Every structure is written in C-alpha cells, then in structure tokens.
C-alpha cells in the first residue's frame, strides 16, 4: 500500500506523459486503494464544462468540486445542481471574480485562445487559489498539441496588510505532434512542476491579484523557456548522440 504509492508514482514518471488520463485510469483499476492518493500527487489534464446560466466555458478540478458537482466561476452555481454547495465568502467571491477577469485577459494575451479559470477559498490565516489554463491545438491533420497548466497559490498576510507571503506551486503539461515527410511523426510530451515563495507589498496600486498575476506570469514564462531550452533541447542532443 504505502510502498505501492512509491511504485505508482515512479511508474507515472516513466510511462508516456501524453497518456496520463488513461494510465491513471488503468492504474487505479489495478490497485483501487490508491484512487485517492494518486490524484492528490499527479496532476491530470483539465476537462472543460459549459456554464448553463451565461454560456461560458470553465475548467474542472477538485478545488471547485463538491460531491459530484462543480462550481462555475462565472455564475457561482454548482452543476449538477446542489442545494447547499460550498461557496466562498461574499468578500472572497468578489476577489474571485476580479481574479478570473484578470487571468482571462492574461490568457488572451499569452495564449490567444483556450480557457482559463480561477477558484479561491479561505484559510485560517489568509486564502488560497487555483489558476487553470487549457489551450488545445486543433485544426490540422499533421500538427497537434495541447497545453494544460495548474497554479496553486497560498496567500498569507502580515504587517497589518501591507505585505504578504505568496507560496506558488505550478505544473505545466505540454505535448506536441508533427507528421511531416522528412521527420516522419514526432511526439514531444512533457510535464514540469516548480515552486516559488515570495514576499510582496500589498497596496492600492499593488493588490493581491497583481502580485499573484506577476507571480504566475513569471513562472509560466520561466517554465516555457525551461521546457524549450533545457528539456526539449536535451532530447535533441540525445538524438544527435545516438547516431
């Protein structure tokens, strides 16, 4: 059991990253005891749902789940309907709507498409939030790809609200596929997880969302360069050392 957790995590690091969902399904089917422990440690590609009140897409994770229902960031309603589903406070929901709008613009500026969603919840000495971004590359028989990123941020306030400590845990899941005549079929698949702690001043001009925004932006920019130049470039050098 506890040792099987070590083996299941190891097996996920070695199986092809483009089949995370199918592998976790087959892995949990093999050992049902780990159904709870796997999903808590390995991130899955995000699924999309349509808000039925205002007709906008939003992304599903455990943080916006309650039972078998998911809460929409747009209408703040559960789907399937829940009479008494977990809601954020009025104060935090206001923040949540501003964070969704801000990262929506962020998504549009860096991704030019896809879907983004933000969910906040309260902690004893602050609040936490998730930022989810999904961008699929569809519309070509020969060139395919998909980006999924998940950002878990923890906010702790101090100095009577003038400074705050931000803890950020980010995972990017990326795959690319080209089918060309010279290079045949090429599949590149990756996942990268990184963390970042930081103190930032909280003011009228530098509010929590601006701090979280700059934090997520720097992390995704850094993870994109790392995936490209350190990790994908390394596999290229390995290819040129095989022959």
């Amino acid at each position: 059991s506890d040792q099987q957790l070590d083996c299941a995590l190891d097996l996920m690091r070695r199986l092809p990253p483009q089949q995370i969902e199918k592998n976790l399904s087959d892995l949990i089917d093999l050992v049902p005891s780990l159904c709870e422990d796997l999903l808590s440690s390995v991130d899955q590609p995000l699924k999309i749902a349509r808000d039925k009140v205002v007709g906008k897409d939003y992304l599903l994770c455990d943080y916006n789940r309650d039972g078998d229902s998911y809460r929409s960031p747009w209408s703040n309603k559960y789907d399937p309907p829940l009479e008494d589903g977990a809601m954020p406070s009025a104060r935090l929901r206001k923040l949540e709507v501003e964070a969704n709008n801000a990262f929506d613009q962020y998504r549009d500026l860096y991704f030019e498409g896809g879907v983004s969603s933000v969910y906040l919840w309260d902690l004893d000495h602050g609040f936490a939030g998730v930022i989810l971004i999904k961008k699929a590359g569809d519309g070509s028989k020969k060139i395919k790809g998909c980006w999924d990123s998940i950002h878990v941020v923890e906010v702790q306030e101090k100095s009577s609200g003038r400074t705050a400590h931000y803890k950020l845990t980010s995972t990017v899941m990326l795959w690319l596929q080209t089918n060309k005549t010279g290079s045949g079929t090429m599949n590149l698949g990756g996942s990268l997880t990184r963390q970042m702690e930081k103190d930032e001043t909280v003011s009228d001009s530098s509010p929590h969302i601006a701090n979280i925004g700059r934090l997520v932006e720097d992390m995704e920019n850094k993870i994109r360069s790392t995936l490209n130049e350190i990790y994908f470039g390394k596999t290229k050098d390995i290819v040129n050392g095989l022959r």
């Binding site: 969902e21 976790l24 399904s25 159904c35 709870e36 999903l39 808590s40 899955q44 699924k47 455990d62 943080y63 789940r65 309650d66 039972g67 078998d68 977990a86 919840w121 309260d122 902690l123 936490a128 878990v152 941020v153 923890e154 803890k167 845990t169 963390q195 702690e197």
Partner: peptide
C-alpha cells in the same frame, strides 16, 4: 519541496477524474 495549501474544508465526495 514545501506543501500545497489545504483544500477547501467541508466538501463531500472523494477524489475522482473525468
């Protein structure tokens, strides 16, 4: 390295996918 913040409290249901 360091742990992720605790999830929202008072939530029914166990974890699942899709």
């Amino acid at each position: 390295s360091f742990a992720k913040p605790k999830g929202p409290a008072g939530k029914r249901g166990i974890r699942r996918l899709i």
